[PDB]
Coordinates of C-alpha atoms in Angstrom, one line a residue:
Chain A
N1 CA 50.0 -133.3 -82.8
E2 CA 48.4 -136.9 -83.7
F3 CA 48.7 -138.4 -87.1
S4 CA 45.3 -140.5 -87.4
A5 CA 44.3 -143.1 -90.2
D6 CA 41.0 -143.2 -90.9
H7 CA 40.6 -142.5 -94.0
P8 CA 42.6 -143.2 -97.9
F9 CA 45.7 -142.7 -97.8
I10 CA 49.4 -143.3 -99.7
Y11 CA 52.0 -145.6 -98.0
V12 CA 55.4 -146.1 -99.0
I13 CA 57.8 -148.6 -97.8
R14 CA 61.9 -148.1 -98.7
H15 CA 65.7 -148.1 -98.1
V16 CA 66.2 -145.1 -95.4
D17 CA 67.6 -143.2 -97.9
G18 CA 67.2 -145.2 -101.1
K19 CA 64.5 -146.5 -103.5
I20 CA 60.8 -147.1 -102.8
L21 CA 60.3 -150.5 -102.2
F22 CA 56.7 -150.6 -102.7
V23 CA 54.1 -148.0 -102.5
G24 CA 49.8 -148.7 -102.3
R25 CA 46.7 -146.4 -101.1
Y26 CA 44.5 -147.6 -98.3
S27 CA 40.9 -147.3 -99.3
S28 CA 38.9 -149.6 -97.8
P29 CA 39.6 -152.2 -94.8
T30 CA 39.3 -155.2 -97.0
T31 CA 39.1 -158.1 -94.4
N32 CA 41.2 -160.0 -96.0
Chain B
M1 CA 55.7 -142.9 -109.2
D2 CA 54.2 -142.8 -112.6
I3 CA 53.1 -146.6 -112.6
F4 CA 51.4 -146.5 -109.8
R5 CA 49.9 -142.7 -110.7
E6 CA 48.9 -144.6 -113.7
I7 CA 47.4 -147.7 -112.3
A8 CA 45.6 -146.1 -109.1
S9 CA 43.9 -143.6 -111.5
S10 CA 42.3 -146.4 -113.0
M11 CA 40.5 -148.2 -110.3
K12 CA 39.9 -145.1 -108.0
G13 CA 38.7 -145.7 -104.9
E14 CA 39.7 -148.6 -104.9
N15 CA 42.8 -150.9 -102.2
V16 CA 45.7 -150.1 -104.8
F17 CA 49.8 -152.2 -103.7
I18 CA 52.5 -152.2 -106.1
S19 CA 56.1 -153.1 -106.1
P20 CA 58.2 -150.4 -108.4
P21 CA 61.4 -152.2 -108.2
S22 CA 59.8 -155.6 -109.2
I23 CA 58.2 -153.8 -112.5
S24 CA 61.4 -151.7 -113.2
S25 CA 63.4 -155.6 -113.2
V26 CA 61.4 -157.2 -115.7
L27 CA 61.2 -153.9 -117.8
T28 CA 65.3 -153.5 -117.5
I29 CA 65.6 -157.5 -118.8
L30 CA 63.2 -156.7 -122.1
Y31 CA 65.1 -153.6 -122.1
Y32 CA 68.1 -155.3 -122.5
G33 CA 66.8 -157.5 -125.4
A34 CA 64.8 -154.5 -127.0
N35 CA 66.2 -152.9 -130.0
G36 CA 65.0 -150.0 -132.5
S37 CA 62.7 -147.4 -131.0
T38 CA 61.2 -150.0 -128.5
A39 CA 64.8 -150.0 -126.8
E40 CA 65.4 -146.2 -125.9
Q41 CA 60.7 -146.0 -125.4
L42 CA 61.4 -148.7 -122.8
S43 CA 65.0 -146.7 -121.6
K44 CA 63.2 -144.3 -119.6
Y45 CA 62.5 -147.8 -116.4
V46 CA 66.2 -149.3 -116.5
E47 CA 68.1 -149.7 -113.8
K48 CA 70.2 -152.4 -113.0
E49 CA 70.0 -152.2 -109.1
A50 CA 66.7 -153.9 -108.2
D51 CA 66.9 -155.8 -111.8
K52 CA 69.3 -158.5 -110.0
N53 CA 68.7 -161.0 -107.2
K54 CA 70.1 -159.6 -104.0
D55 CA 69.1 -158.3 -100.6
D56 CA 69.4 -155.5 -97.9
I57 CA 68.2 -156.4 -94.7
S58 CA 64.6 -157.2 -94.8
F59 CA 64.1 -157.2 -98.9
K60 CA 65.5 -159.8 -101.4
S61 CA 64.6 -160.7 -104.8
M62 CA 64.6 -162.6 -107.9
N63 CA 64.7 -162.9 -111.4
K64 CA 63.6 -165.5 -113.8
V65 CA 63.3 -165.1 -117.6
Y66 CA 62.4 -168.1 -119.9
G67 CA 62.3 -168.7 -123.3
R68 CA 60.3 -170.8 -125.7
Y69 CA 62.0 -174.4 -125.9
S70 CA 62.0 -173.8 -129.9
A71 CA 63.6 -170.5 -130.2
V72 CA 67.2 -169.4 -130.4
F73 CA 68.8 -167.0 -128.2
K74 CA 71.5 -163.8 -128.2
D75 CA 74.9 -164.5 -126.6
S76 CA 75.0 -160.6 -125.2
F77 CA 71.4 -160.5 -124.2
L78 CA 72.4 -163.8 -121.8
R79 CA 75.0 -162.8 -121.2
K80 CA 73.6 -159.7 -119.6
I81 CA 70.4 -161.6 -118.0
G82 CA 72.9 -164.0 -116.8
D83 CA 72.0 -166.8 -114.4
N84 CA 69.4 -166.5 -114.4
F85 CA 67.2 -167.9 -118.0
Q86 CA 65.8 -171.2 -118.9
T87 CA 64.3 -172.6 -122.4
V88 CA 61.3 -174.1 -121.5
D89 CA 58.2 -175.9 -123.2
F90 CA 55.0 -173.2 -123.5
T91 CA 52.3 -175.7 -124.2
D92 CA 54.0 -177.9 -121.9
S93 CA 51.0 -178.0 -119.1
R94 CA 53.4 -178.6 -116.1
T95 CA 55.6 -175.7 -116.8
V96 CA 52.9 -173.6 -115.7
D97 CA 53.3 -174.9 -112.5
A98 CA 56.3 -175.5 -112.4
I99 CA 56.7 -171.2 -112.0
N100 CA 54.2 -170.7 -110.0
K101 CA 56.3 -173.3 -107.7
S102 CA 59.2 -171.4 -107.9
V103 CA 57.6 -167.9 -107.1
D104 CA 55.2 -169.4 -103.7
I105 CA 58.5 -171.2 -102.4
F106 CA 60.5 -167.8 -102.7
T107 CA 57.9 -165.4 -101.6
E108 CA 56.8 -167.9 -98.5
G109 CA 53.9 -168.7 -99.8
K110 CA 52.8 -165.3 -100.5
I111 CA 52.7 -165.1 -104.2
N112 CA 51.7 -168.3 -104.7
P113 CA 49.8 -168.6 -108.4
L114 CA 51.7 -165.8 -109.8
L115 CA 49.7 -167.6 -113.6
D116 CA 46.3 -167.8 -113.3
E117 CA 45.1 -169.4 -117.1
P118 CA 47.7 -171.9 -118.5
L119 CA 50.4 -169.9 -120.1
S120 CA 49.0 -169.7 -123.7
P121 CA 51.1 -171.9 -126.4
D122 CA 52.4 -169.5 -128.4
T123 CA 54.4 -166.9 -125.3
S124 CA 57.5 -166.2 -127.0
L125 CA 59.0 -165.5 -123.7
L126 CA 58.4 -164.9 -120.0
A127 CA 59.6 -163.5 -117.6
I128 CA 59.8 -162.9 -114.2
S129 CA 60.5 -160.5 -111.0
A130 CA 59.6 -161.8 -107.4
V131 CA 60.4 -159.8 -104.3
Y132 CA 60.2 -160.6 -100.7
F133 CA 59.9 -157.8 -97.6
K134 CA 59.3 -158.5 -94.1
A135 CA 60.7 -156.6 -91.1
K136 CA 60.1 -155.9 -87.6
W137 CA 58.3 -152.2 -85.8
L138 CA 61.8 -150.3 -84.6
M139 CA 58.8 -149.4 -82.3
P140 CA 56.3 -152.3 -81.7
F141 CA 52.4 -150.7 -82.0
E142 CA 51.1 -151.3 -78.1
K143 CA 49.0 -154.3 -78.6
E144 CA 47.2 -153.2 -75.1
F145 CA 45.9 -150.3 -77.8
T146 CA 44.3 -152.0 -80.8
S147 CA 40.6 -150.9 -80.4
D148 CA 38.1 -150.0 -83.5
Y149 CA 38.6 -146.9 -84.8
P150 CA 36.1 -145.4 -87.2
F151 CA 37.1 -145.3 -91.3
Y152 CA 35.7 -142.8 -93.7
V153 CA 36.1 -145.4 -96.1
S154 CA 34.2 -142.3 -98.2
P155 CA 32.9 -138.3 -95.8
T156 CA 29.3 -140.7 -96.0
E157 CA 30.7 -144.7 -96.3
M158 CA 31.8 -145.9 -92.8
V159 CA 33.7 -149.0 -91.8
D160 CA 34.6 -149.7 -88.4
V161 CA 38.6 -151.2 -88.5
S162 CA 41.3 -152.4 -86.2
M163 CA 43.2 -149.4 -85.7
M164 CA 47.3 -150.0 -84.6
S165 CA 47.9 -147.4 -81.9
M166 CA 50.9 -146.0 -80.4
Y167 CA 51.8 -142.9 -78.1
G168 CA 54.5 -140.6 -76.4
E169 CA 57.0 -141.2 -79.4
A170 CA 59.0 -138.8 -82.0
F171 CA 58.7 -139.8 -85.2
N172 CA 60.1 -137.7 -88.2
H173 CA 56.5 -135.7 -89.3
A174 CA 55.7 -133.2 -91.0
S175 CA 52.8 -131.0 -92.2
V176 CA 53.1 -129.9 -96.5
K177 CA 50.9 -127.7 -97.5
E178 CA 50.3 -127.1 -101.4
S179 CA 48.1 -126.3 -103.5
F180 CA 46.6 -129.4 -104.5
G181 CA 45.5 -130.1 -100.5
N182 CA 47.3 -130.4 -97.3
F183 CA 48.5 -133.0 -95.6
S184 CA 50.8 -134.6 -92.9
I185 CA 53.5 -136.7 -93.8
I186 CA 55.5 -139.3 -91.1
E187 CA 57.9 -142.2 -90.8
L188 CA 57.2 -145.4 -89.0
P189 CA 60.6 -147.3 -89.3
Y190 CA 61.4 -150.7 -89.6
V191 CA 64.7 -152.2 -87.6
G192 CA 67.0 -152.4 -90.0
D193 CA 67.4 -150.0 -93.1
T194 CA 63.9 -149.8 -94.4
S195 CA 60.9 -147.2 -93.4
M196 CA 57.3 -146.7 -93.9
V197 CA 56.2 -142.6 -95.4
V198 CA 52.8 -143.0 -94.7
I199 CA 51.0 -139.4 -96.3
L200 CA 47.3 -138.9 -94.9
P201 CA 45.8 -136.0 -96.5
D202 CA 44.6 -133.2 -93.6
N203 CA 40.6 -133.2 -95.2
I204 CA 38.9 -136.6 -95.2
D205 CA 38.3 -136.5 -98.7
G206 CA 41.4 -134.8 -100.6
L207 CA 43.8 -137.5 -101.4
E208 CA 43.1 -137.6 -105.0
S209 CA 44.8 -134.2 -106.0
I210 CA 47.6 -135.5 -103.7
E211 CA 47.8 -139.0 -105.4
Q212 CA 47.6 -137.1 -109.0
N213 CA 50.5 -135.3 -107.7
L214 CA 52.6 -137.6 -106.1
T215 CA 56.3 -137.9 -108.1
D216 CA 60.0 -139.2 -107.0
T217 CA 60.5 -135.1 -107.5
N218 CA 57.9 -134.2 -104.3
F219 CA 58.1 -137.5 -102.5
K220 CA 61.4 -136.5 -102.2
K221 CA 60.9 -133.0 -101.2
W222 CA 58.5 -133.5 -98.6
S223 CA 60.8 -136.7 -97.1
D224 CA 63.2 -134.3 -96.5
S225 CA 61.0 -131.5 -94.9
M226 CA 60.4 -134.1 -91.8
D227 CA 61.8 -133.2 -88.8
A228 CA 61.8 -135.1 -85.0
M229 CA 58.1 -134.3 -83.9
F230 CA 56.0 -136.3 -81.2
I231 CA 52.9 -137.3 -82.8
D232 CA 50.8 -139.6 -81.5
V233 CA 50.3 -142.0 -83.9
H234 CA 46.4 -143.9 -85.3
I235 CA 47.4 -146.1 -88.2
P236 CA 45.1 -149.6 -89.6
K237 CA 46.4 -152.7 -89.2
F238 CA 45.2 -153.8 -92.7
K239 CA 46.3 -156.7 -94.9
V240 CA 45.8 -156.3 -98.7
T241 CA 46.9 -158.4 -102.0
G242 CA 46.8 -157.1 -105.5
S243 CA 46.4 -158.3 -109.0
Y244 CA 47.3 -155.8 -111.9
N245 CA 47.2 -155.8 -115.7
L246 CA 50.4 -153.0 -116.7
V247 CA 49.8 -153.3 -120.2
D248 CA 47.0 -150.4 -120.3
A249 CA 48.8 -148.6 -117.5
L250 CA 52.5 -148.9 -118.8
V251 CA 51.2 -148.3 -123.0
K252 CA 49.6 -144.7 -121.6
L253 CA 52.7 -143.9 -120.1
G254 CA 54.0 -144.1 -123.8
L255 CA 55.3 -147.4 -124.2
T256 CA 53.4 -148.1 -127.6
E257 CA 55.5 -150.3 -130.0
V258 CA 56.8 -152.5 -126.1
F259 CA 53.7 -155.0 -126.5
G260 CA 52.2 -157.1 -128.9
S261 CA 53.5 -157.6 -132.8
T262 CA 55.1 -154.5 -133.4
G263 CA 57.8 -155.0 -130.1
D264 CA 61.3 -155.3 -131.2
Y265 CA 63.7 -158.0 -128.9
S266 CA 66.0 -158.2 -131.6
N267 CA 68.8 -158.3 -130.1
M268 CA 67.8 -161.2 -127.9
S269 CA 66.6 -163.6 -130.1
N270 CA 66.5 -165.0 -134.0
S271 CA 63.5 -166.0 -133.5
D272 CA 60.6 -163.4 -133.3
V273 CA 59.5 -163.4 -129.9
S274 CA 56.5 -160.7 -128.3
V275 CA 55.6 -160.4 -125.0
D276 CA 51.5 -159.2 -124.6
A277 CA 50.6 -159.3 -120.9
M278 CA 52.8 -157.9 -117.8
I279 CA 51.2 -159.2 -114.5
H280 CA 52.0 -157.6 -111.1
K281 CA 50.3 -159.7 -108.0
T282 CA 51.1 -158.3 -104.6
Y283 CA 50.6 -159.1 -100.9
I284 CA 51.2 -157.1 -98.0
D285 CA 50.7 -157.6 -94.4
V286 CA 50.6 -154.8 -91.8
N287 CA 49.8 -155.6 -87.5
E288 CA 51.7 -154.3 -84.6
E289 CA 54.7 -156.0 -84.7
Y290 CA 55.5 -156.4 -87.9
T291 CA 55.2 -155.9 -91.6
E292 CA 55.4 -158.8 -94.1
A293 CA 55.3 -157.7 -97.9
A294 CA 55.9 -159.1 -101.0
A295 CA 55.6 -159.1 -105.1
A296 CA 55.7 -161.0 -108.8
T297 CA 55.6 -159.8 -112.3
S298 CA 56.4 -161.6 -115.0
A299 CA 55.7 -160.3 -118.7
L300 CA 54.0 -162.7 -120.7

């Protein structure tokens, strides 16, 4: 019962039950 | 998702962040003006919904279409685009700095230089969409737990990173088990009506087969199967920026008679207008308090 995002993953921002506002992939930390 | 699939497919192993609405926003403009094959071939991405200058709690959008100062446009096309059209001199140096500024102000200075190299003097028209998003987590990550956790850029390449964490809470989780790999999917809601649904492959290297299977049907399906569960969360606080040219992607997706001279934008102008580039620049910032995101795209 632990969700650890310490490796490549997909994330999606959205309206509760609406359209997808964004969608990306987290591959590297890219110290911005 | 197919455009994402496409973009993500070309740059494997690299951060990618796009905004389907922003993109679909301009494609819809182009559609209104398109005619013949270009039209139907572009209809596949038409949505008058987010193709406006709306807002729903923490997400605001903006549309703008600039035409060649010399061309003459159709009234009907102008009717649809409505309050989002102007005739500009492209050869005019200032013009570019005029546009960028508009997008700059609008996206809280997040997507500043929307346009790079001076805008080609031959460009016939320029369709643009800008979007901004910022909301706080309904459940602000515990600042007194953000420590450094190792991250697997690859099974071998290790790189520490800031890890946001929170325990004792319940979130809509789910443990999908598909033939293309197994993953967990969770929902971190923001205050309002929007949330972030993260898809984390169970194995440290199965993301690929998963991503190449990401469809709106699937995503919707997996999202529904989610139930209120108790899980401890560890998500990296990150901040990235992107710059993509969707001409390549879109063409492979079927849009062949859309860019270049073959493009038929007859229902838009008596003149022979064309668009050769689709620019999409983006910005996101995720931390233990809020999430600020924004993006802008233009069909040069």
